[PDB]
Antibody, heavy 215, light 211 residues
Framework: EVQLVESGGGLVQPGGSLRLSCAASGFNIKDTYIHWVRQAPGKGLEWVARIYPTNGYTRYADSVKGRFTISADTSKNTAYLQMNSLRAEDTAVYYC?????????????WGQGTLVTVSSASTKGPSVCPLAPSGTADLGCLVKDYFPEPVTVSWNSGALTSGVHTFPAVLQSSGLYSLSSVVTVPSSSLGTQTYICNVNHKPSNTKVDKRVEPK | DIQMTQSPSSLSASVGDRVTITCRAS??????VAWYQQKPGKAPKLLIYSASFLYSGVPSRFSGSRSGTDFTLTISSLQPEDFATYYCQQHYTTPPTFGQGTKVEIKGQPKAAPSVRLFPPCSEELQANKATLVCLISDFYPGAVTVAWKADSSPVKAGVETTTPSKQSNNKYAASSYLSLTPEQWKSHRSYSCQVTHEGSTVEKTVAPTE
């Protein structure tokens, strides 16, 4: 069974460095070229580099030259991408790939991909504030200006489940995330029932609570 | 550097449609062209190599052909597992290049109109000299939505940040739009408005500093 397995990837800062790996099995690298291909979120595929592990001959795309280095290792059956001088626009899912063999220059096998995020934003827990409600009403919590993903939002410590809708985060031009969570509740519960949103941002080791009250 | 121009960028099809996708190469590439399929969060899978050779295990309702620098993928009768994104690629020269992709989408069941929920600023932000209007858009299908913001009744383009629609677990869509303001700005107007238009229906919601 031909397989390609990638490892490494993650958040890094511009200027910084990361190393990806592509462990082959089910065939011998040496018999073919190994490639790296990458996919910026919401975009197409862009070839990045290539190596013939029999001799180490490399090729690169212009946008990466002098920045990235593809390499291989016979013994361990493994290709690497060393990525330096990283920029925001190297953010992508990075796939490794091979040609078939002989004159078969389509990519028949791909690894599962690994995500690399390049951002200058610094780790930061969110500023949370309650979204006051004006049958039913709508109330919520605005989770503002955190980095990186993710956050988890519960209501009344996980006890309040009906009417709960937590929305996907927007990534703002600033490079920070914001999101909202709303609950639909009985209008007759307002001013009486306690509603608390509990916000947990593990990357900054931060939990925040906020009580939501009518006005 | 050889460019692959793929058309169309998107298509909604019915199961059983004959679907054709086209790639124009910017210069001659012979027959050194592959097609790939990709599903969300997965790796591309090879469909067709050397322009017209069907890869092993790919159903035969798939085929590819060439006229000049025009390359074409045909699916004779669309099946559900075919809904996906398709990419062509030339492998004639280095570097190999891809089309921008064609998204083949389900022509969805009856539409659903969005709930729009528009909130004014928090105190906590006002006291820190910030302000955010929050427009939450849920339970709509298909997942294409036009968001317009207005102050009094004048269009506002500045400081809009809107998410791309994402599928809820109920298979309808949600999205969020945030208008960033200063308190000054907020108080300067009588009302602000979040306008959502979806499949020919407009849902407007407004909020006012004076309560």
């Amino acid at each position: 069974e031909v397989q390609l397995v990638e490892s490494g990837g993650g958040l890094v800062q511009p200027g910084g460095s990361l190393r990806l790996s592509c462990a082959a099995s089910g065939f011998n690298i040496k018999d073919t070229y190994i490639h790296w291909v990458r996919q910026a979120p919401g975009k197409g595929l862009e070839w990045v580099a290539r190596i013939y592990p029999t001799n180490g001959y490399t090729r690169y795309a212009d946008s990466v030259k002098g920045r990235f280095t593809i390499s291989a290792d016979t013994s361990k059956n493994t290709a690497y991408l060393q990525m330096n001088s990283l920029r925001a626009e190297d953010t992508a899912v990075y796939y490794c790939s091979r040609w078939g063999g002989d004159g078969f220059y389509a990519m028949d096998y791909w690894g599962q991909g690994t995500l690399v995020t390049v951002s200058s934003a610094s780790t930061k827990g969110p500023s949370v504030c309650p979204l006051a409600p004006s049958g039913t009403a709508d109330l919520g919590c605005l989770v503002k200006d955190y980095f990186p993903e993710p956050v988890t939002v519960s209501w009344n410590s996980g006890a309040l489940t009906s009417g709960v809708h937590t929305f996907p985060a927007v990534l703002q031009s600033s490079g920070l995330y914001s999101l909202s969570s709303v609950v639909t509740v009985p209008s007759s519960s307002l001013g009486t029932q306690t509603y608390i949103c509990n916000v947990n941002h593990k990357p900054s080791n931060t939990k925040v609570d906020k009580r939501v009250e009518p006005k | 550097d050889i460019q692959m121009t793929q058309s169309p960028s998107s298509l909604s099809a019915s199961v059983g449609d004959r679907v054709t996708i086209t790639c124009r190469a910017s210069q001659d590439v012979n027959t050194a062209v592959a097609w790939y399929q990709q599903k969300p969060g997965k790796a591309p899978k090879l469909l067709i190599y050397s322009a017209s050779f069907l890869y092993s295990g790919v159903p035969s309702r798939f085929s590819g052909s060439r006229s000049g620098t025009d390359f074409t993928l045909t699916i004779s009768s669309l099946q559900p597992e075919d809904f996906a994104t398709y990419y062509c690629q030339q492998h004639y020269t280095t570097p190999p290049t891809f089309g921008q992709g064609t998204k083949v989408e389900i022509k969805g069941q009856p539409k659903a109109a969005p709930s729009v929920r528009l909130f004014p600023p928090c105190s906590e932000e006002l006291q820190a000299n910030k302000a955010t209007l929050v427009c939450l858009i849920s339970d709509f299908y298909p997942g294409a939505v036009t968001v317009a913001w207005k102050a009094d009744s004048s269009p506002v383009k500045a400081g809009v940040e809107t998410t791309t629609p994402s599928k809820q677990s109920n298979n309808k869509y949600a999205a969020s739009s945030y208008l960033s303001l200063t308190p000054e700005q907020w108080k300067s107007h009588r009302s602000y408005s979040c306008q959502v238009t979806h499949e020919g229906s407009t849902v407007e919601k407004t909020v006012a500093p004076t309560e």
